[PDB]
Design a protein around this ligand. Structure first.
Ligand SMILES: [Zn+2]
Ligand SMILES: [Zn+2]
Length: 509
């Protein structure tokens, strides 16, 4: 009933879920685990939604466009408060809720594989930490590492792999930057370097960016959704809590327009958030090209503040709090569901299954799937790294989930600009595919000895958790036995490849 889309705060497992993960078959014990997690909850990415609505508020106040002076005061208080809170935290930065999400995930990662890690501490095993290099990803990982270390009494602190390209020389010193697997959607890397032309990583990012920038199905479908009459009706319905009918009628008639500038006009300057140091926090300055032209723009901007306000829960104290939830109560939650669809649709079409007949939107995650299998192989073939813990982005998780065919990401939309992705015709939701701190974890077990039905060793087996729910792999994959969520590593190398073939009976133990 709250409709936070992919700003949904992570929902940690209850002690029932966390204690009922399936046991591996008799004879199999842990040898490896790994993860990729999105950063946790964050503040606003830049001075933009809050900036534009303040410009709109200024004009509404001048023109008598608020429904009352108390509603005006409350709206401006809410805008000022969340802006102030982002100046204080840093635009784009992890919040307290986001740190707590990753602390708990880290604690539970140690606990789920306690025997693996206690053995690693006694036998010289190593743990590898990786980040895209983006601050909120690295800081998420730092909090995971803190929770992991606290749960294990610090007994693994001396078993961390030393990065050759650390995210920073301070709290992030344990994090190897790996933007080829954790930032494969862009040529530019978060640390300010770029992928090198001609590398596989550069070509993957470059081809993807060129595809999405020019694809007519994606562009037409997003246009259909942006101009949908029910989205416009929802936008008006929401905004009428705050602004008068006359004010909104003028906006509907194109008589108002606001740019993200000092005075909301086209000739205004770059405006930075009040009290921000643009050299310390450049994201506190807005892109002047952003604008409110419609009720749709304004309502989607307000919805974005509501959902990020949930991410900023821990910051929402003191004398400049914000109460955007007040605008999405009762029947206005129906409006929130419309805005969540519009926001989800952009992500779905650009980074998820998207439309039928193409795999460009999610094939970009192949380097991460490659690494998920390659780091298992490194361990089974005699390496000492017992875990690889990775921290990244929604732009990592959405294509990865579609490439793997995870629950929620199994349905492409029609190859159509009018029969588009909707909540009625697709299971994809930001709140469940890629909440804040969304994560995929794989546990790998093995049986000692020589398999007398082959010449060599028993095949390692693999089990997946998605947002800490144990899930099967995609339906083409055959588990090791009836009733099992464990899969042979050989089976996964076959059934997760493009053909999705199964080894059939040879997948059974
Ligand atoms: Zn303050
Ligand atoms: Zn109305």
């Amino acid at each position: 009933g709250r409709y936070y889309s992919s700003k949904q705060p992570y929902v940690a497992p209850n002690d029932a879920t966390a204690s009922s993960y399936s046991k591996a078959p008799k004879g199999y014990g842990p040898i490896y685990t790994e993860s990729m997690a999105r950063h946790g909850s964050r503040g606003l990415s830049s001075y933009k939604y809050d900036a534009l609505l303040m410009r709109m508020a200024e004009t509404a106040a001048r023109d008598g466009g608020f429904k009352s002076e108390a509603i005006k005061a409350e709206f401006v208080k809410n805008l000022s408060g969340i802006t102030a809170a982002n100046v204080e935290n840093g635009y784009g930065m992890l919040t307290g809720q986001g740190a707590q999400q990753h602390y708990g995930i880290g604690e539970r990662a140690y606990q789920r594989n306690r025997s693996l890690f206690d053995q690693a501490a006694a036998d010289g095993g190593t743990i590898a930490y990786q980040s895209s290099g983006e601050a909120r990803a690295t800081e998420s990982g730092e909090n995971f590492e803190k929770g992991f270390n606290e749960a294990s009494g610090g007994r693994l602190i001396g078993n961390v792999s030393a990065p050759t390209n650390p995210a920073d020389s301070g709290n992030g010193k344990d994090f190897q930057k790996n933007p080829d697997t954790l930032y494969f959607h862009k040529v530019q890397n978060p640390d300010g370097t770029s992928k090198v032309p001609g590398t596989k990583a550069y070509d993957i990012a470059n081809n993807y960016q060129n595809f999405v920038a020019n694809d007519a199905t994606i562009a037409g479908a997003e246009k259909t959704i942006g101009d949908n009459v029910d989205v416009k009706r929802a936008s008006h319905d929401l905004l009428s809590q705050i602004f008068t009918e006359e004010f909104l009628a003028k906006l509907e008639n194109g008589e108002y327009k606001w740019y993200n500038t000092t005075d909301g006009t086209k000739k205004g300057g770059k405006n930075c958030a009040p009290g921000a140091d643009a050299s310390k926090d450049p994201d506190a300055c807005g892109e002047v090209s952003k604008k409110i032209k419609s009720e749709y723009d304004a309502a989607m901007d307000l919805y974005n503040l509501y959902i990020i306000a949930a991410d900023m829960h821990n910051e929402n104290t003191g004398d400049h709090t914000f109460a955007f939830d007040q605008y999405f109560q009762g029947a206005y939650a129906d409006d929130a569901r419309m805005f969540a669809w519009a926001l989800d649709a952009e992500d779905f079409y650009e980074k998820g299954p998207s439309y039928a007949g193409q795999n460009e939107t999610y094939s970009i995650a192949q380097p991460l799937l490659d690494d998920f299998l390659n780091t298992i192989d490194a361990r089974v073939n005699g390496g000492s790294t017992v875990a690889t813990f990775r921290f990244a982005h929604a732009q990592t998780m959405m294509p990865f989930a579609a490439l793997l065919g995870l629950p929620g990401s199994t349905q492409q939309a029609p190859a159509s600009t009018t029969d588009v992705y909707t909540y009625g015709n697709n299971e994809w939701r930001g709140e469940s595919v890629t909440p804040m701190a969304a994560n995929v974890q794989w546990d790998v077990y093995a049986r000692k000895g020589e398999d007398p039905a082959t010449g060599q060793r028993y095949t390692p087996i693999v089990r997946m958790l998605y947002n800490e729910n144990e899930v099967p792999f995609r339906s083409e994959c055959t588990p090791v036995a009836d009733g099992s969520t464990w899969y042979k590593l050989t089976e996964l190398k076959s059934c997760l490849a493009a053909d999705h073939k199964t080894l059939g009976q040879d997948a059974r133990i």
